[PDB]
Write a protein that binds this ligand. Structure first.
Ligand SMILES: CC(=O)N[C@H]1[C@H]([C@H](O)[C@H](O)CO)O[C@H](P(=O)(O)O)C[C@@H]1O
Ligand SMILES: [K+]
Length: 381
């Protein structure tokens, strides 16, 4: 496919609202100022769908944001863009939908793309600051789906708000960021992050929600330690294993009882160092013969700060516990205003295998085809 391309250009995109009016951002010429938090999902048709926060006015988290979607049917050479999910537009300074997590799955025979984003309107502080209510009244977690290969998206009426309210100890919940997965048994699984109510000692926890149809969701009874909460889950034999953001070394836990109890997973626990503050990272599995190998992307953060330099691809040997840097695909110092995030996507359509990444590059979202690295990754078992 193309080796590298720009999916969304900082200060170079113009979006229209649901009425057809142009959204005037703070970028030059009234363009969208900054893009963050990329999520990518590839379909059985080879279609690449990329989601990202379109932070129209500033890179700040508490700002005016819509979820943009870019679709490529030519291997990432050209992109068709639009807004997939619009914020409520209650507050022109703060209304937002943010931090996408997507899943491409076959739900009862229908290939579907799901995108889940957190939604806020009047909260002006970071989401972790709201722990008085269960749940926070300004918050919501919305799910949209596409059943036509990423062309149109529509809201799914879900029971997610209900399960959170019923739990009673969760102030807000968000996807783990990047991509979720469909288990071997067909269940849809979104890794999640959660801010607990003020009474709970642990402020953050990680877990997941699962569903068979994408409409009715469930939360398991247990909780995994929170750390930097952003996380991805992979299926390994009869276990679900997560890979969590943490200031310093990443953490990885395993559940053998479907979310009831979690224990450290040695093969990936404390293997990659993201240094100061930590960063979101993407972790997926790639089959090789009858075995599995985990591919992972996150920043080396050579400056030990918010610049999160050197977004790299790592291979994790799930059997021996060995880790190897495969490719430092973005060996640059990022913009401290918001940098370092990424999302990997592997797919084998018939006999064609592709490994793609999407990542933050100074306010823009870039795409790279990393398929040439597959033989090396696949040998790590
Ligand atoms: C919902 C939300 O706030 N998401 C933001 C999170 C969040 O604030 C932290 O994880 C603390 O919870 O921070 C990151 P970053 O600043 O590390 O790049 C950007 C995300 O868009
Ligand atoms: K933040």
């Amino acid at each position: 496919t193309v080796e590298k391309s720009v999916v969304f250009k900082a200060e170079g995109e113009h979006f229209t609202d649901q009425k057809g009016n142009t959204i005037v951002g703070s970028g030059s010429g009234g363009t969208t100022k900054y893009f963050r938090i990329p999520a990518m999902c590839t379909t059985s048709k080879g279609t690449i769908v990329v989601f990202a926060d379109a932070r129209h006015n500033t890179a700040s988290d508490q700002s005016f944001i819509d979820t943009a979607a870019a679709r490529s049917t030519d291997g990432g050479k050209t992109w068709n863009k639009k807004i997939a999910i619009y914020n409520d537009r209650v507050n022109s300074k703060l209304s937002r939908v943010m931090d996408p997590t997507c899943i491409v799955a076959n739900i009862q025979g229908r290939e579907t793309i799901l995108v889940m984003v957190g939604k806020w309107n009047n909260n002006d502080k970071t989401w972790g600051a709201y722990r008085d209510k269960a749940p926070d009244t300004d918050w919501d977690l919305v799910l949209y789906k596409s059943t036509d290969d990423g062309v149109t998206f529509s809201k799914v009426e879900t029971n997610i708000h209900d399960i959170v309210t019923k739990n009673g100890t969760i102030s807000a919940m968000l996807g783990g960021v990047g991509s979720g997965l469909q288990l071997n048994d067909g269940k849809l699984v979104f890794p999640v992050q959660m801010v607990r109510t003020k009474n709970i000692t642990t402020v953050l926890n990680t877990s997941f929600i699962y569903s068979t149809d994408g409409i009715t969701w469930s939360l398991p009874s247990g909780y995994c330690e929170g750390f930097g909460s952003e996380n991805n889950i992979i299926e390994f034999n009869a276990s679900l294993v997560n890979n969590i953001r943490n200031s310093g070394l990443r953490r990885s836990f395993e559940t053998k009882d479907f979310g009831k109890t979690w224990t450290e997973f040695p093969p990936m626990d404390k293997k990659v160092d993201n240094r100061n503050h930590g960063v979101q990272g993407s972790t997926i599995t790639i089959p090789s013969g009858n075995k599995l190998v985990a591919a992972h992307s996150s920043a080396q953060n050579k400056n030990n700060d918010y610049t999160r330099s050197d977004i790299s691809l790592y291979a994790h040997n799930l059997y021996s516990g060995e880790v190897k840097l495969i490719d430092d695909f973005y060996p640059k110092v990022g913009n401290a205003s918001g940098a370092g995030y990424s999302c990997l996507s592997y797919r084998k359509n018939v006999d064609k295998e592709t490994l793609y990444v999407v990542y933050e590059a100074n306010g823009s979202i870039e795409f790279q085809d990393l398929s040439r690295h597959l033989p090396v990754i696949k040998s790590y078992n």
